[PDB]
Amino acid sequence: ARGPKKHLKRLAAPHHWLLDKLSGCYAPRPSAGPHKLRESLPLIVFLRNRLKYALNGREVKAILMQRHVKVDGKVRTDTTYPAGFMDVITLDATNENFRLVYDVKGRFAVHRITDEEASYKLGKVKKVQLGKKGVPYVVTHDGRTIRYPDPNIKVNDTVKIDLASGKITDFIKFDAGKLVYVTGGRNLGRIGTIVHKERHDGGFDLVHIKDSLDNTFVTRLNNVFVIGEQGKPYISLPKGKGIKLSIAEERDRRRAQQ
Amino acid sequence: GISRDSRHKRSATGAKRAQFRKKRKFELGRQPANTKIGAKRIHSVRTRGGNKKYRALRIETGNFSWASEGISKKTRIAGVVYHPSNNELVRTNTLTKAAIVQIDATPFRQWFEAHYGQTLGKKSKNAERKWAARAASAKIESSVESQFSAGRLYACISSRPGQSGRCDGYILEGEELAFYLRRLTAK
Amino acid sequence: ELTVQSERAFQKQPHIFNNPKVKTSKRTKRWYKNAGLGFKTPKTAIEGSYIDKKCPFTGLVSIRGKILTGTVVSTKMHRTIVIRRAYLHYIPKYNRYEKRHKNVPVHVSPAFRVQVGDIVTVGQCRPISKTVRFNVVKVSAA
Amino acid sequence: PRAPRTYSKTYSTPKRPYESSRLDAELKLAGEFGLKNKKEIYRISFQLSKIRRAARDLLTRDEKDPKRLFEGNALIRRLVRVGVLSEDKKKLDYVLALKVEDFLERRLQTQVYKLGLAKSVHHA
RNA sequence: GCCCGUCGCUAGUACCGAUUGAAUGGCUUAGUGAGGCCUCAGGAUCUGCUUAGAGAAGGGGGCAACUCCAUCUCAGAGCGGAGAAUUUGGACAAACUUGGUCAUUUAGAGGAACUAAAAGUCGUAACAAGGUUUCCGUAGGUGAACCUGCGGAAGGAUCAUU
RNA sequence: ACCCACUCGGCACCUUACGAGAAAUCAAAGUCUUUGGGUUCUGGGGGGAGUAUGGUCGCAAGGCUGAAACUUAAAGGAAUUG
RNA sequence: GUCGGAUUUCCAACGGGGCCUUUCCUUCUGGCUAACCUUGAGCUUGGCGAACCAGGACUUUUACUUUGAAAAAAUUAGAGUGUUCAAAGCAGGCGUAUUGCUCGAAUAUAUUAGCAUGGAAUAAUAGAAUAGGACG
RNA sequence: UAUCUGGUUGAUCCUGCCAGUAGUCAUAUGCUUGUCUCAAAGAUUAAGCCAUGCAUGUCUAAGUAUAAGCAAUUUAUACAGUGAAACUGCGAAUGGCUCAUUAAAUCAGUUAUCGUUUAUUUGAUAGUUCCUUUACUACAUGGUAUAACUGUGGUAAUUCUAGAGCUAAUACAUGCUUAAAAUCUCGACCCUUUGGAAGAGAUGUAUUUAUUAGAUAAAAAAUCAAUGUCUUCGGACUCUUUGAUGAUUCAUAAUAACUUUUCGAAUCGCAUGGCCUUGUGCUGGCGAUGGUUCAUUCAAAUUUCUGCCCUAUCAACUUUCGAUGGUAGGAUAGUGGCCUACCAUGGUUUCAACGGGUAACGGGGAAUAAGGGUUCGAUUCCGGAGAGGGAGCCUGAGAAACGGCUACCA
RNA sequence: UCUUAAGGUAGCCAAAUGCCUCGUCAUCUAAUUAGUGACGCGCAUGAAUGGAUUAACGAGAUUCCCACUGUCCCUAUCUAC
């Protein structure tokens, strides 16, 4: 390779970005950031082909350098800034916040909500360990680390970050009967009230997740992300509620209520 | 251009691999240390990602730890006497990891007299009570006592002079010292 | 091999030390570990005199990755053996199988005594040598 | 480099070129449905073969399969939208047995002539 | 009637072939062996160092033989120190001769092998019991097909004897 | 020793064979387009040609292995008509 | 009984799960005090364990079945969509002609090895032989 | 769209090929120069050679200014406009091209790092140094030339330079300014003894030790080497710390020491409104530069399990001292015969090793499709190799880099 | 057809045997009456007056190549008698 990869082409970019194969040969490559290369949505493409607010790369970059938008409470004037799942980006113009959530079909859906949901967000703990000077800490999916966590937080948990302070207001653990969000694989964007788990000592645990339609499926432990307790959510569910309806029923429901 | 890959190496079946790739910067190797005694010349060599390596040459003084007494002092190496890898190393008097050397140990002797204060061979009240409390534990072994009387402790330098630039080591205790002195006596 | 201290160097587990100044019970100190994945450390490894720094029970190697099973075919090489895995390859055109055997060398701890014909399970570890990449974890041929 | 742009063929030359029956029948149909060339019947037969093969590989699968139901419903919806088949027949026999003549006697070129606002297919 | 083989004519193809010849010959227990790199060295040049030995009254001085204090300037030498030029041992290692088949044959004199041969010369070898039944294995001889001697076969000219 | 019956095992054939095969013909050459009991060896139009630069065995004669260039639209099998 | 389909009393073919037939689905014990010996006035608050999990042995080898990671994305199969059709592409919309949203961008073992639970017919493979045998 | 037909004979039935037929995101060629549409395009032979011109440079409110440039200066007696050149920082290791080499080598799927990566990362900094020290000593905070410039010269000459003199840091050996608690090494009181409060001081972050906490299966009574908070020295003695996966010597914290010393704004813009103990003192908010640290990320590196074409006209292959393994060392960012010192004859193989050929880069994939298949994949995306053939290297986080260098060779 | 007893078979050859002859072709060299290979109407080869071949051997006779050298270009100098 002789070095790191600095370019990305269309048809070689992840599917959920929804880039047309014409009108160019290269894709907006996200540089180092809080989220993975594949499981993230760059700000430029997000502004371009999801809101249609801007129609040019030059106009998008000018918007970014004029400090008219900000991410997670920070301006972050990066022309290809990557913002992935559970990312909050508020807009001072009309003060509308967009949460980058996953739709039922498996693409980066955008949810427009108000200032309270802009302030409060959710994160998934990746690992919990002890740093230098006997300081314990955690790792989140977006890198939003909080120092000195409460000792109950273990791996595969979820926390609420106020985006302003460094204190975890709410924490939700991992057990049977919890509202979850599968982020990975073919079930991208499904809520299925986790039932049980097969550990399979040695790694690669499996979790049985069943939607309200009693559609039960399985997923890797690395893909499930608990988002709240049964009933009420911690964050607003996207349109479709993550059901993944059968093909005949979905098609005739589109035909009826088109 | 010291290579480190297995591509130049013949396969497990005895076949000779063809030249697939030109050797890269990654799998490079460098010349050994061959650290001598006296007049330290530590050379810094840049490695991948920075991480300056310290190639020790002509090392003078090293830090040695007494495992039994729980102390470590900086003493001068008299010279290497045994090396399990190569006798040529002993002959040239070079310093490598896990090498059996002799040291002055006069820091160690002074620390022993300050700690226990027990007459060997053959003054405040606080010092008296402290020596009495630390007493009844000066029974290390006859071999160690005789070596201290001779004035040159047996040590194993077990650091990496070619990586860190220091010949840190530990004093030979018990079975280790017995085995190594047995090898020294055996032909 | 026959004796613990045959080599001109001294064989010991690193960073474990027994004080010769003190005289308590169980004077010598040896360190073991659980290999993981439900494999039991045998009494020979627990209270043996060997060191075998490259063993997965008292040495400084770790077992993680793949787990294989095979019958050993040679033992004349020291402190390690080669197991034989007689799988079968399927080809689609003729819709049947063929016997293909793969010989993979595996390190064996002195905790196990292995002869030809023994069925042995091995676990993947870090590259131990030029050819050896697996470590013997259990033998089931008495 | 430029991303690829796909292209496809639409007509199939028949396996044997000289049939005194096939050539004659295709000449009758081209003349009586106003078709300037033979590649047009070739491509219409290509589409007919495509839809017939889709129907065949749909029918080869067992009943009540959701994939079968969806594919059959979509094919029936498209065929009703184009209108070559009566909208009160769901036995799929007509769509599988659809012939080139029946397919061609529904496209707009025959429709204008039969409605009489052109008085000739060539004039249209 | 079909038909076989030498021999003559033409053309093409491949093979053998003296010539110890000419496609990474990949590596010699090989020898030379640049160049870079690590290194056993005297560090030829340099910045800040002690005015003590030099011409000095002075600021302090019983302005009568002694001093913190640099300057227009040179001394008998010790550090913070890259290190050039060079140089000793190495370890990589370009490129010049060599016990190796090739995955073209070349220039190959010559050596009547083969298929096409054109309406060729010499005799019928086979096809009928083809006028000596044919054919196979082996051996020998002769212009040519062939002939003969031995073992067999019927794909024979005998499924058949009392 | 012979005859009359039953055999077990091995050498042969004519029913317009319902079986198979192009046909001669076949108790197997049947149980093979209604195609699968288990295996080994051999062939892919006729020549060149059983001819190899080669490799092995043989004292030799020769044996085993064994092409290609090139050429050809036929070569051949089984009846049926003189 | 309601054509762009559904039963609360069922003669039947059935994917299937437990009951006992020398056969406890294979365990010595607990977390939520577990579908039940327990029980003022027809609503039954500790004996027989597993519906979510651990300390103690075998989860003994191989060839199939739904899944998951996912078999990159393209490219093929290919829902929807006036590029005027079609190749294509994921485009494309106006009623309160001046303050909405999106129908979408799919359900397809895509030379096929490796991991996880229930299914063990088929073909091998080892269990107790001049008992180093199982039970305490 | 699961199809055939012509050709041996006077004639017939046959195995059998030669043809005919239909396709090619398969080419070339000959005849046609009429029109919307994106557009394949020197790959086959020659990864053969290149004349020419281009393809890598770079700025903001926020690194250094004065080509002897521009005009307002009116807030500057030091400026916050423009600021070409040059220094510093970063990039140039991306991209684009080709397929030469390469047959378990790449590559595909799937793994491992508890065997290692990390410019700008990135989420934030880290009250620990006034080292002959309660006073060599600036912290309202140090020193020099290397550049452009003022002129001088060298050859036909090169993105050539010798020069004498001015000037800057994210430059250098330096360097320090900000508390405060607790523990630890010694110590003027006892012709004794369950005491240290004064003092000399050490305890941030890299390398070696060695241990403690780095513990859960499971509970009943005597003992001692000496009393340890304290009822009545019959002794109640408990609250005493204890983090995930299956697993590590794991991430960690401490203990005398090793550091030859790498370090914790001796950088700059933008807002500057409060109080007087008058200093421009005390204070007031944001923005590119950093850390010897991790809080995953873009990246590299080896690595596990299976799978690759034709050949026996290739049955044995693997070594002066690597040829499989063991111990130790060296080197590497670490694993490892990767390289050295010391044993056996160890490893592969008819289940095809080894050797040879490839008109071989490997995949997604391309052409017909009843099925099973047979060919192709240089080429629009991924991975690998190269940038005349070889090698060896500096800078750099990352190159065996060639639109970087060194040396030898068409 | 003449003709003998038979008319030189297998082999080999400008051979130590070929007059013409320094035969002809190829190769070896810059150049070759030399050497080797090949061709044979062979003045006048040829089969125990033995034919052909042949590993090893040879103070046997020719050719070429490498190394090496005063054989030579082109001679010079030294020692002993």
CA distance B113 to A238: 78
Q: Check: CB of residue A71 under 8 Å from CB of residue A92.
A: no
Burial class (CB in 10 A: 0-12, 13-18, 19+), A204: exposed
Report the neighbours of A using a cutoff of 3 or more CB pairs below 8 angstroms.
Answer: C, D
Handedness of CA C53, C57, C61, C67 (dihedral sign): positive
Q: Which residue has the tokens 């889709």?
A: D54
CA distance C10 to C18: 15
**A206-210 vs A196-198, strand pairing mode:** antiparallel
Q: Is A130 on the interface with D (CB under 8 A)?
A: no
Q: Which residues of D49-65 are buried (b: 16+ CB within 10 A; e: fewer)?
A: eebbebbeebeeeeeee
CA distance A190 to A102: 8
C47 φ/ψ angles, rounded to the nearest 5 degrees: -125, 30
* Residue type (1 letter), A248: A
A89 φ/ψ angles, rounded to the nearest 5 degrees: -135, 110
List Cβ<8 Å contacts ≥24 apart for D22-31: D29/D100, D29/D101, D29/D104
Question: What's the Å distance between residue A208 CA and nucleotide H328 C1'?
Answer: 53
A35 φ/ψ angles, rounded to the nearest 5 degrees: -130, 165
Task: Give strand H nucleotides closer than 7 A to any protein Cβ.
Answer: 1, 3, 20-25, 38-40, 92-97, 101-106, 111-115, 117-123, 186-190, 193, 195-196, 205, 207-211, 243-249, 251-253, 255-260, 293-307, 317-319, 322-355, 369, 372-374, 380-386, 391-393, 395-402
Q: Is the CB of B43 under 7 A from strand E?
A: yes
CA distance C30 to C48: 9
Burial class (CB in 10 A: 0-12, 13-18, 19+), B127: exposed
Two tokens, residue A55:
């129609």
Residues of chain C by 3-state class (helix, strand, coil), percent to 5: 5, 30, 65
Domain boundaries, chain A: 1-116, 121-171, 174-244
Report the neighbours of D using a cutoff of 3 or more CB pairs below 8 angstroms.
Answer: A
CA distance A184 to A106: 9
Residues of chain D by 3-state class (helix, strand, coil), percent to 5: 55, 0, 45
Two tokens, residue C75:
């033992």
**Distances, alpha carbon A126 to alpha carbons A11, A40, A138, B74, in Å:** 30, 17, 7, 45
Two tokens, residue A116:
């309270």
**Distances, alpha carbon B80 to alpha carbons B91, B94, B101, B133, D3, in Å:** 9, 7, 4, 37, 69
Q: Check: CB of residue C83 under 8 Å from CB of residue C73.
A: yes
CA distance B167 to B101: 10
Two tokens, residue A14:
């992840």
Q: What is the resolution of this structure in A?
A: 2.7
Handedness of CA A12, A15, A16, A19 (dihedral sign): positive
Q: Is the CB of B120 under 7 A from strand E?
A: no
Longest CA–CA separation in chain D, Å = 53
Q: Which residues of B83-120 are buried (b: 16+ CB within 10 A; e: fewer)?
A: bbeeeebbeebbbbbebbbbbebebbbeebeeebbeee
CA distance A211 to B21: 53
Contacts of A239 (CB under 8 A, 6+ apart): A103, A109
**B61-66 vs B169-171, strand pairing mode:** parallel
Q: Is the CB of B55 under 7 A from strand E?
A: yes
Q: Check: CB of residue B151 under 8 Å from CB of residue B105.
A: yes
CA distance A219 to A205: 9
Domain boundaries, chain C: 1-142
Q: What is the DSSP string of A134-183?
A: G-EEEEETT----BS--TT--SS-EEEE-SSSS-EEEEE---SSEEEEE-
CA distance A77 to A63: 9
Q: Which residues of C103-132 are buried (b: 16+ CB within 10 A; e: fewer)?
A: eebbbbbbbbebeeebebbbbebeebeeeb
The three-state secondary structure class of A205 is coil
Contacts of A173 (CB under 8 A, 6+ apart): A152, A154, A157
For residue A17, the 8-state DSSP code is G
First to last CA, chain A: 50
Return the closest nucleotide (C1') to the Cα of B58. E40
Two tokens, residue C93:
């055109």
Task: Determine the protein residue whose CA lies at the shortest distance from the C1' of H381.
Answer: A12
Which among A93, A106, A11 has a CA at the least distance from the CA of A51? A93
Chain CA centroid to CA B125, Å: 39
CA distance D45 to D32: 16
First to last CA, chain B: 40
Contacts of D16 (CB under 8 A, 6+ apart): D22
Chain CA centroid to CA B13, Å: 40
Q: Check: CB of residue A170 under 8 Å from CB of residue A144.
A: no
CA distance D66 to C58: 58
Q: What is the DSSP string of B106-156?
A: HHHHHHHHHHT--------HHHHHHHHHH-S-----HHHHHHHHHT-EEEE
Two tokens, residue A191:
């809520």
Chain CA centroid to CA B146, Å: 21
Residues of A in contact with C38 (CB under 8 A): 201
Two tokens, residue A82:
């990557």
What size, in residues, is chain C? Answer: 142
Q: Which residues are B156's β-sheet partners?
A: B100, B170
Q: Check: CB of residue A197 under 8 Å from CB of residue A154.
A: no
CA distance C14 to C8: 17
Return the closest nucleotide (C1') to the Cα of B5. H338
CA distance A61 to D109: 53
Strand ranges in chain B using DSSP code E only, listed in sequence order: 2-3, 28-29, 41-47, 50-57, 61-66, 71-82, 99-103, 153-157, 169-171
CA distance A239 to A166: 31
Number of other CB atoms surrounding residue B180 within 10 Å: 20
Taking CB atoms and an 8 Å cut-off, how many pairs form between chains B and C?
Answer: 32
Number of other CB atoms surrounding residue A6 within 10 Å: 7
Which among D88, D15, D89, D92 has a CA at the least distance from the CA of D51? D92
Chain CA centroid to CA A156, Å: 15
Number of other CB atoms surrounding residue D4 within 10 Å: 8
Task: Determine the protein residue whose CA lies at the shortest distance from the C1' of H401.
Answer: A2
Give residues 162-181 of chain A lying near strand G (Cβ < 7 A). Answer: 175-176
* Residue type (1 letter), D101: E
Residue B38 — left, alpha, or beta (φ > 0 → left; ψ -120 to 50 → alpha)? Answer: left
